[PDB]
């Protein structure tokens, strides 16, 4: 009776464990298998997929009890896909030190300074931080929020769980063939709205042209990760149409600052100032992508500055910084996994011409999916950052802050003021002091260039008109109240 939904995707996450799966590819599957305590209701009050409104989901209700603690009263009788009941012990294990120190390597890095949860009774749990945090609600309504089954997860382990996941969500896991496909089936025991698809298959078609062809042949219902130039060919078919939105993600490139050439900021800044981002955005994105003024976005709220000035493209100063660095003309690789990111390779080719004008030789190192390149082989690599809280702390603090990946793993030796301001904004209410501390972090980041911010992508999907689904302003696919078949 219900139609089978087929989605052609750019890739699959390494795992379906909610934290390990954090990437451009995981949420669109994880969002279907799991629910969090709080859900971002993208379409609430007439919004077109961009509403920040957080509403209770596995939590029937909640109350903030002090500046570091929230008491959650859970929905009763909700079942995981294996029959076990969702209780306070599952929620406590989800945000426990045992689960978040998985060796799940980024559980600790993305999380606030959680104190241990308190199970007050079967359906009541207090989630709390060791220091004051006014962001707890936002953290529990984000991609960190999915609730996992304690006993099943403990018996399997994080990675085996990530291959056979069990959650409470509208679609249950059926099968996975690594780097090929994931198939989910409707959970007719779902506590929320009835799932409208019989099955949902996510099938990897790494090349966009082959993926557009699949939609025309009728092998796919929806396809992901297209560019604004693909819209003309697709929209020509009366049966098909494109659906796009400006998402809360940033396309960027970053450096292995352990490498001697990038241990200092001089050549990082030359590589940053030589990029003419408005020309790339015009030529490849039809001006649909948006250049931000540092890590600065409308969904941040009180920490968004509309009047902030952008970083200027300056070839003259980039040439002078190249000369100043002593750069001897060694070709620098730029690792890119094909077009995992929309317009990744055409943007790199344009930037190579801009870097050549500055006197820098950058060569592409296109690597196939499945090839996990070693850290030592990386010089420049592309990346993206999902701005995953409706707040300024993510991703300037969460990715580039003290003790986290960019500084520890990739060796960015950040200034003292930056790291102190990162700690201060975690324990600080919105207002005048917080807003200026974020514009100070933005100024330091611009001067050090541990990464270069390209643009906020205009995320383009394509679909059959007989599949009623609207994209959301994030790197996921929401089908709750947003998936009908004509
Ligand atoms: O760009 P990919 O690697 O698919 O996913 C990134 C994550 O690596 C990153 O940790 C997260 C938050 O910054 O944003 C994603 O979009």
| Listed residue (267, 362, 282, 379) closest to 317, CA to CA | 267
- Helix, strand counts (H, E) of the chain: 17, 20
370 domain-assigned: yes
In the chain, the N- to C-terminal Cα span, in Å, equals: 13
User: Is 387 a pocket residue for ligand 1 (Cβ < 6 Å)?
Assistant: no
Q: Are 186 and 177 in contact (CB under 8 A)?
A: no
Cα 54 to ligand 1 centroid, rounded to whole Å: 22
In this structure, are residues 340 and 371 in contact, taking their beta carbons and an 8 Å threshold? no
Cβ–ligand 1 distance for 27 under 6 Å, the answer no
Residue 21 Cα to ligand 1 midpoint, Å, equals 10
83, part of any domain: yes
Q: Which long-range contacts (CB under 8 A, 24 or more apart) does 139-143 make?
A: 139/111, 139/112, 139/389, 140/36, 140/37, 140/38, 140/70, 141/36, 141/37, 141/38, 141/39, 141/40, 141/54, 142/36, 142/40, 142/388, 142/389, 143/18, 143/22, 143/27, 143/30, 143/386, 143/388, 143/476
Residue identifier of the C-alpha nearest atom 6 of ligand 1 = 23
Specify whether 259 is located in the same domain as 372.
yes
Do 414 and 318 lie in one domain? The reply is: yes
Helices assigned H by DSSP within 201-343: 208-217, 231-235, 266-273, 277-285, 315-325
Statement to judge: residues 423 and 296 lie in one domain:
yes
Helix (H, G, I), strand (E, B) or coil at 260: helix
Q: What sign does the CA torsion over 185, 189, 190, 195 have?
A: positive
Write the DSSP string, 54-115.
Answer: EEESSEEEEEEEETTEEEEEEPSS-B-TTS-B--HHHHHHHTSHHHH----TTHHHHS--BP
Task: Name the residue at shortest CA distance from atom 9 of ligand 1.
Answer: 385
- To test the ligand 1 pocket, which listed residue (386, 391, 395) has its Cβ within 8 A of the most ligand atoms? 386
Q: Which residues of 63-74 are buried (b: 16+ CB within 10 A; e: fewer)?
A: eeeeebbbbbbb
Assess if residue 96 is contained within a domain. Answer: yes
Question: Are 273 and 405 in a shared domain?
Answer: yes
CA separation, residue 367 to residues 20, 251, 334, 453 (Å): 21, 18, 10, 22
Q: What's the CA-to-centroid distance between 378 and ligand 1, angstroms?
A: 17
Closest-lying ligand 1 atom to the alpha carbon of residue 388: 12
Q: Are residues 307 and 414 in the same domain?
A: yes
Q: Which SS3 state, helix, strand or coil, does residue 245 take?
A: strand
Domain check: are 416 and 314 in the same one?
A: yes
What strand order describes the sheet that includes 362-366? Answer: 362-366, 332-336, 380-386, 249-255, 451-455
Taking CA atoms, 130 is separated from 121, 180, 272, 426, in Å, by 22, 42, 38, 12
In DSSP notation, 308-329 reads PPPPPP-HHHHHHHHHHHT---
Does residue 399 have its Cβ closer than 6 Å to ligand 1?
yes
C-alpha 327: how far from its chain's center?
Answer: 34
Q: Tell me the two tokens of residue 457.
A: 């992508």
For residue 451, give the 3-state DSSP assignment: strand
Cβ contact 18:148 at 8 Å: yes
Report how far ligand 1's centroid is from the alpha carbon of 10 (Å): 14
Q: How many A from CA of 252 to the centre of ligand 1?
A: 10
Q: Establish whether residue 23 lines the binding site of ligand 1, counting it when its CB lies within 6 angstroms of any ligand atom.
A: yes
Closest CA to 9 of 483, 475, 457, 336: 475
Helices (H), 401-481: 405-408, 416-426, 432-448
Please tell me whether residues 283 and 374 are part of one structural domain. Answer: yes
> 465: which residues sit within 8 A by CB, 6+ positions away?
238, 239, 240, 241, 486
**The domain boundary residue, chosen from 157, 181, 202:** 157
ω into 109 cis (within 30 of 0)? no
Rounded Cα–Cα distance for residues 447 and 441 (Å): 10
Q: How far is residue 436 from each of residues 106, 112, 299, 386, 440, measured CA to CA in Å?
A: 29, 22, 17, 23, 6
CA dist 446 and 223 (Å) reads 35
Same domain for 370 and 273: yes
Are 270 and 360 within one domain? yes
DSSP β-bridge partners for residue 334: 364, 380
What are the angstrom distances between the C-alpha of 155 and each of 163, 306, 326?
Answer: 13, 49, 55
Do the domain assignments include residue 146?
yes
CA of 24 to the centre of ligand 1 (A): 6
224 CB near ligand 1 (under 6 Å): no
Q: Is the CB of 395 under 6 A from ligand 1?
A: yes
Looking at the chain, how many residues does it have?
486
What CATH number should be reported for the domain holding residue 465? 3.40.190.10
Q: Pairing state of beta strands 222-226 and 5-9? A: parallel
End residue of a domain, out of 157, 191, 212:
157
Domain count, the chain: 3
The reply to whether ligand 1 has any atom less than 6 angstroms from the CB of 225 is: no
281 in a structural domain: yes
Per the DSSP assignment, residues forming a β-bridge with 226 are: 460
Measured between alpha carbons, how far is 20 from 42 in angstroms, rounded to an integer?
Answer: 24
Buried b (16+ CB within 10 A) or exposed e, 130-159: eebbbbbbbbbbbbbbbbbbbebbeebebe
Do residues 88 and 145 share a domain?
yes
- Measured CA to CA, the distance from residue 73 to residue 37 in angstroms comes to 10
Please report, to the nearest 10 degrees, the dihedral formed by the alpha carbons of residues 56, 59, 60, 64 taken in order.
-80
Helix (H) / strand (E) element for 335: namely strand 332-336
Does the Cβ of 385 fall within 6 Å of ligand 1?
A: yes
Residue 22 CA, ligand 1 centroid: distance in Å: 6
163, part of any domain: no
Output the domain CATH number for residue 265. 3.10.105.10
Is residue 48 in some structural domain?
A: yes
For residue 93, give the CATH number of its domain.
Answer: 3.90.76.10
Cα gap 294→443, rounded to integer Å: 8
Same structural domain, 273 and 417 = yes
Query: What contacts 24+ positions apart, CB below 8 Å, involve 409-417?
Result: 409/375, 410/254, 410/255, 410/256, 410/257, 410/258, 410/375, 410/450, 411/256, 411/257, 411/258, 411/263, 412/257, 412/448, 412/450, 413/257, 413/263, 414/444, 414/448, 414/450, 415/444, 415/448, 417/444
The protein residue with its alpha carbon nearest to ligand 1, atom 1, reads: 384
Provide CB contacts within 8 A for 104, sequence distance 6+: 17, 19, 20, 158
Q: Which two tokens stand for residue 136?
A: 């707890």
Residue numbers of the domain that contains 448: 249-456
Under a CB-based contact definition with an 8 Å cutoff, are residues 95 and 109 in contact? no
Dihedrals phi, psi of 179, to nearest 5 degrees:
60, 15
Q: Could you tell me the distance, in angstroms and rounded to a whole number, from the CA of residue 388 to the centre of ligand 1?
A: 10
Q: Is any atom of ligand 1 closer than 6 Å to the C-beta of 24?
A: yes
Structure-token pair, residue 30: 């994880």
Q: Compute, in angstroms, the gap from residue 38 CA to the centroid of ligand 1.
A: 22
Tokens linked to 175: 């099968």
Same domain, residue pair 17 and 144: no
| 383 Cβ below 6 A of ligand 1 | yes
22 touches ligand 1 (CB under 6 Å): yes
Distance, in Å, from the CA atom of 63 to the CA atom of 345, rounded to the nearest integer, reads 48
Q: Which residues contact 64 (CB under 8 A, 6 or more apart)?
A: 70, 136, 137
Select from 104, 135, 157 the last residue of a domain. Answer: 157
Residue 164 within a domain:
no
């Amino acid at each position: 009776d219900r139609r089978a939904l087929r989605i052609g995707v750019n890739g699959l996450p390494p795992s379906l464990e909610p934290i390990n799966g954090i990437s451009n590819t995981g949420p669109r599957i994880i969002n279907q298998i799991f629910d969090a305590l709080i859900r971002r209701d993208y379409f609430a009050d007439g919004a077109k997929g961009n509403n920040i409104k957080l509403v209770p989901a596995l939590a029937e209700s909640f109350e903030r009890i002090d500046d570091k603690s929230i008491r959650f009263k859970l929905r009763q009788g909700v079942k995981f896909h294996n029959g076990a009941e969702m209780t306070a012990e599952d929620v406590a294990f989800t945000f426990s030190s045992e689960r978040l120190w998985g060796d799940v390597p980024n559980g600790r890095n993305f999380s606030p300074n959680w104190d241990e949860p308190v199970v007050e009774d079967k359906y009541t749990v207090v989630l709390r931080t060791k220091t004051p945090s006014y962001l707890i609600e936002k953290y529990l309504g984000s991609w960190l929020g999915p609730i996992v089954p304690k006993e099943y997860y403990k018996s399997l382990g994080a990675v085996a769980f990530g291959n056979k996941p069990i959650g409470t969500g509208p679609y249950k896991f059926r099968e996975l063939v690594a780097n090929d496909h994931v198939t989910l089936e409707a959970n007719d025991g779902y506590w929320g709205d009835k799932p409208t698809a019989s099955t949902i298959t996510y099938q990897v078609v790494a090349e966009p042209a082959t993926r557009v062809a699949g939609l025309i042949s009728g092998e796919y219902d929806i396809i992901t990760t297209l560019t604004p130039d693909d819209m003309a060919l697709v929209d020509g078919y009366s049966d098909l149409e494109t659906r796009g939105t400006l998402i809360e993600n940033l396309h960027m490139f970053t450096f292995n600052m352990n490498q001697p050439i990038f241990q200092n900021k001089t050549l990082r800044r030359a590589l940053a100032l030589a990029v003419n981002r408005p020309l790339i955005v015009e030529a490849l994105w039809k001006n649909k992508a948006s250049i931000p003024n540092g890590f600065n976005f409308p969904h941040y709220g009180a920490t968004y500055d509309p009047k902030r000035k952008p970083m200027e493209f300056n070839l003259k100063e980039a040439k002078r910084l190249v000369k100043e660095s002593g750069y001897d003309g060694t070709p620098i690789t730029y690792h890119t996994m094909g077009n995992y990111y929309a317009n990744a390779v055409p943007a790199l080719m344009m930037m190579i011409e801009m870097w050549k004008a500055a006197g820098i030789t950058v060569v592409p190192k296109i690597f196939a999916p499945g090839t996990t390149p070693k850290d030592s082989d990386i010089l420049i690599r592309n990346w993206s950052n999902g701005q995953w809280l409706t707040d300024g702390l993510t991703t300037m603090v969460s990715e580039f802050g003290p003790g986290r990946g960019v500084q520890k793993r990739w060796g960015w030796k950040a200034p003292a003021e930056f790291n102190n301001l990162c700690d201060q904004v975690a324990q600080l209410k919105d207002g005048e002091e917080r807003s200026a501390a974020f514009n100070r972090l933005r100024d330091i980041f611009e001067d050090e260039a541990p990464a270069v911010l390209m643009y906020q992508p205009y995320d383009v999907y394509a679909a059959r008109k007989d599949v009623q689904w609207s994209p959301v302003s994030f790197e996921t696919m929401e089908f709750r109240g947003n998936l009908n078949f004509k």
